[PDB]
Design a protein around this ligand. Structure first.
Ligand code: NA
Ligand code: NA
Lengths: 527, 527
């Protein structure tokens, strides 16, 4: 029952969590029915793709274009919440190759990289699924999360609808491992989509392709030591740590309490994943699909191309939609990809400025709550603004991860950063939303954007140690063509051959006279 | 400290077992030295095989013949004792394809098939290596074990020198996972070899080829989640349950306390197994090598042919020696085998009567102590005698497994069966030792053997409901050519064309007048 979510550890009278049905019980009651229902959905998907514009082929899917709303959005919120939020930890030195830290991998890595921590803090008898009842979500207010996104200046919201251990934020007909059956006992994704739609936030559907473990029905026994000859555990390469592939032996006392709620199938992809995706799309009508966890199986074999075509086709002539690039390797036997935009993770890297892209990260290294995170290891508001503008100037969006604890509460450090960014965007948003890169992006610590129609150039000034700005080939319309967003203060400037030389007004030498203390923005009418 | 070995469960104040060195410490201190020492041993082995009669080739090894002493022995004792003896359990329904039950697989299957039992009875925090201090061996008297083998009528003794988790009954220079460092704190194999030699028992060296897990040194990291980039866990297919092959990621909090004492190497076979085998052979000068655990790697790749040639070669001119057939599949890339005799396990199956073979089993299904075993699920003395004679008549030896508890004490049920068999053999042993199959083996519940020279036929009579024995083509020498071992009672008989008809003396109708109550034996001087 009781833990402090801000310093989470084993409760004093921990009892094991047994879902009303174990995995064999779920097999005996639900598997056949689920597999029949899945067969029907697959036929529906095939027909929609038959009738529709888009076919499950790269050639066909690549012709879909990034919508204007996505290019114009610039800022999204990535709502990284789930059972992993309860322990809310990754240890020092366990960073991924991205450079990020992954508390949101705790459910898997508790038996591996994070096991020393788990053994001492939670106990060796505390299983993955024991976290599910502890994810009560009593401070999780879906209305306030949508409002916070708005107040942060975000134009889209992507909750972690279903991550790699298979727990769905929505009430599903294809799994009892869902938010109504387990944890907060409410349809969290439904609350969030309703809260988002009534605020004009675009809504993204985050969907893990593979899962770390899934119980499957087999035609032969895996080994002679197995209690069941008709059942196994399915893996692909998603977990990165080598496991038996495709099948591991199934042992109830080992597996049941890391797969609570999951109904066995013969075919993980066809019988479970495909219809679960369809259900999410059909129920929630997302504007965006954010695939993840598809590096373990080629997109050809996982059948994600059919899901991508479906998503496009059920939207055609209703709304413009977009998909990320994480469907997996697209082969025709590195590989190629499908999807509308690249998703560099934590570290921006070398980006192609010609095509819109999206970086995902939180204000710290953490993907998922880390209870040890605080002001000193997180971005300052100043650093966040600076980082955001740099992203936008280079044709990117920021999908800003936020990391609530097991109660669903967001730390003040994270709240304050979001509200400071949003308050900066309230003033300077005209130089951000619906902008495109200019022929210069960054110069002398100043950042440039242009309005998509080309009438205005914006210059974001973040450093109070500045007096003159020299901009080659700016070409202001007339001597009154330069102003400051959110201010009446007149900007004096002169041309000097090709270079425009701007003197910062006297009052703006001190950043307490700025409309917003984290930066001011010059608006330049050009032509 | 305290458990009841006859009903073993988690001690009351269990503390974790940490060997003075963990796996990284063993790597830093000992690995280099071990790998240099291994290099020297490998050169020694290569030279011995270079200069010697036998080469590491099937053609060469197959020319070695089963020694007369093995064919003449008939009965051996298989001393199945180790860390697994402490928990002393396998659950119902977990039988191998052999039909046997394997408490001696507990160390592995505690995380798999036997995990339900282990979780409730020992606890999820109780690791494999926690059993090692509990194997105190305070009732393990090596002198009495050798004497018991003699009193059972056994001619050879095969202790479980090293089983699949790698714990050596001898003090080794190639592992700290040995009987002196861990468990009874004495050189158990040394005690047993000395006790055996002074009783003229032949001595067998039981040696597992593969182990379930071994820490190995790598040239690159297995996954990005690994704490060490220079280390992994090596597996082959020996465990049967699929594992990552050849390498799994290594995690100290997961692995260290199932591999206590084991010094990491680059090459499991070359750097560890080969020199450990050599050490055992050189130190103990065994008459017999009993390989096991070689079905996970072909004999070609494990390099066991070189060990077989070595063993033969270091014995040439000193003693006649023998090897079983469990080196592994012999290929030249359904496969062939090397070794001197077949080893059907638990169930005899279809045997080739033309070549000597050996069946291994205990008086119950169990390989390894099962604390729930008792009189009612074990062979009676009568059934054991009957089973033994059937084996011998078909050209087999019985390698009779005995199963002590964690204190090293053997159950009375097991002791009584052995003493009854030995007492039957004391009387009737002339019809067993140094015998060969006759043209009839079993007929009408009677069993036949012949002396190896062909002078005598022996007929073992086990059922008191018998008055006449009719034997085709038994040609007795003269009218006084038939007697009863251990008795002066005259045996009357008549020929009737091809058939010899023997009347059982009046007194022998009741089995209380038999020299031994479990059977009497006719001795027939023939042509
Ligand atoms: Na495209
Ligand atoms: Na041979």
């Amino acid at each position: 029952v009781q833990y402090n979510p801000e310093k989470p550890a084993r409760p004093e009278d921990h009892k094991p969590f047994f879902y009303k049905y174990n995995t064999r019980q779920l097999y005996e009651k639900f598997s056949d029915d689920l597999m029949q229902r899945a067969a029907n959905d697959r036929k529906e998907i095939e027909k929609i793709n038959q009738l529709g514009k888009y076919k499950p082929k790269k050639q066909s899917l690549d012709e879909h274009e990034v919508p204007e709303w996505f290019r114009d959005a610039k800022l999204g919120i990535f709502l990284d919440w789930g059972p992993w939020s309860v322990p809310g930890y990754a240890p020092p030195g366990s960073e991924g190759d991205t450079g990020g830290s992954y508390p949101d991998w705790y459910e898997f890595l508790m038996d591996f990289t994070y096991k020393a921590y788990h053994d001492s803090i939670w106990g060796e008898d505390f299983r993955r699924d024991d976290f599910l009842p502890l994810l009560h979500g009593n401070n999780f207010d879906s209305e306030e999360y949508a409002e916070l996104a708005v107040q942060a200046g975000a134009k889209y919201m992507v909750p972690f609808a279903r991550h790699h251990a298979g727990w769905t934020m929505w009430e599903s007909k294809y799994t009892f491992r869902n938010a109504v059956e387990m944890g907060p006992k409410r349809d969290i994704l439904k609350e969030l989509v309703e809260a988002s739609r009534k605020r004009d936030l675009k809504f993204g559907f985050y969907f893990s392709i593979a899962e770390w473990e899934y119980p499957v029905i087999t035609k032969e026994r895996v080994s002679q030591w197995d209690p069941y000859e008709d059942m196994a555990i399915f893996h692909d390469g998603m977990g990165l740590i080598p496991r038996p592939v495709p099948l591991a032996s199934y042992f109830p006392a080992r597996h049941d309490r890391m797969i609570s709620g999951k109904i066995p199938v013969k075919d993980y992809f066809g019988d479970y994943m495909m219809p679960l995706f369809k259900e999410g799309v059909d129920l929630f009508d997302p504007d965006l699909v954010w695939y993840d966890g598809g590096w373990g199986t080629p997109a050809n074999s996982s059948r994600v191309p059919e899901l991508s075509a479906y998503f496009y086709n059920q939207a055609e002539g209703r709304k413009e939609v977009v998909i990320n690039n994480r469907a997996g390797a697209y082969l025709d036997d590195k590989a190629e990809q499908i999807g509308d935009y690249l998703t560099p993770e934590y570290s921006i890297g070398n980006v192609d400025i010609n095509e819109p892209w999206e970086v995902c990260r939180s204000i710290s290294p953490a993907f998922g709550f880390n209870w040890t995170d605080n002001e000193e290891n997180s971005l300052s508001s100043k650093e966040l603004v600076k980082m955001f503008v740099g992203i936008v100037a280079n044709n990117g969006n920021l999908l800003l991860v936020i990391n609530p604890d097991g109660s669903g509460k967001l730390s003040n450090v994270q709240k304050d950063r979001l509200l400071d960014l949003g308050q900066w965007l309230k003033v300077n948003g005209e130089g951000i939303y619906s902008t495109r890169p200019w022929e210069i992006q960054e110069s002398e610590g100043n950042f440039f954007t242009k309005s998509k129609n080309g009438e205005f150039i914006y210059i974001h000034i973040l450093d109070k140690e500045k007096t003159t700005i020299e901009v080659p080939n700016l070409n202001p319309k007339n001597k009154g063509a330069i102003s400051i967003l959110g201010s009446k203060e007149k900007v004096l400037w002169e041309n000097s051959g090709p270079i425009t030389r701007i003197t910062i007004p006297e009052s703006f030498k001190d950043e307490r006279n700025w409309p917003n203390k984290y930066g001011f923005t010059l608006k330049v009418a050009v032509k």
